Structure formats: C-alpha cells, structure tokens
C-alpha cells in the first residue's frame, strides 16, 4: 500500500531534519558591535541588564594636527529562513502522500 510513496516519505524526512539542523546550529540573534573600540569581557556580562549602550569612537590624530573619528555602529541581527517556500513544499509532500494513498 505504501510501496509507491516511500520516496516521498524519504523526502519529508530529509526536509524536516534539514529544518532541525537549521534550528540547532545557527544562533537566533546576536548584538553586533562594529568599529575600533575596547570591550572588557567582564563588562559584557552586563549586556542582559544594562539600559544604555554607549559607544565612544576612537579619535585618530594626523601628523599635521588633524583629528577625525572612527565609525562605530551597533545593533541586533537575527537569523531568518524562507518559511513560505519550505512550508509550501512540505505541505505539498504531506498532501501528495495522502492523495496517492486515498
């Protein structure tokens, strides 16, 4: 009865273990901080509980007396995947496994 749909059962196994890898292995989100700066790894532990994040840029002094500021930047980045296309694919697999087996 299922002899003719074993290949779709395989494909649905492979798809779902792919999504389970994506979940395991990538970090949900991280606080990205760029630019020339000093971060004390003891102070970083306050990251959960601080209210203000202050970035003071490195000031570069030129031999002719000029002064100019480095580009600091900071903000959250978060992982994302194509939910629309992968779920439409897995819904097609489930639907077809059921269709060909009545």
């Amino acid at each position: 009865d299922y002899e003719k749909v074993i290949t779709l059962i395989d494909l649905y196994d492979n798809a779902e273990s792919d999504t389970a890898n994506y979940m395991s292995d990538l970090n949900d989100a991280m606080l990205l901080i760029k630019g020339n700066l000093n971060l004390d790894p003891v102070e970083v532990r306050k990251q959960k509980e601080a209210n203000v994040l202050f970035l003071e840029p490195t000031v570069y002094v030129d031999a002719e007396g000029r002064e100019t500021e480095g580009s600091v930047d900071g903000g959250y980045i978060y992982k994302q995947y194509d939910v629309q296309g992968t779920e439409a694919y897995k819904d097609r697999l489930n639907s077809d496994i059921h269709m060909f087996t009545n």
Partner: peptide
C-alpha cells in the same frame, strides 16, 4: 600634541 585615543564601549 594630542595622540590617537582609542574608543570605549560601555553598558553602564
């Protein structure tokens, strides 16, 4: 004569 002063990131 001033010299290059490195920046700081602080969380308060």
């Amino acid at each position: 004569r001033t010299r290059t002063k490195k920046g700081r990131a602080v969380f308060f």
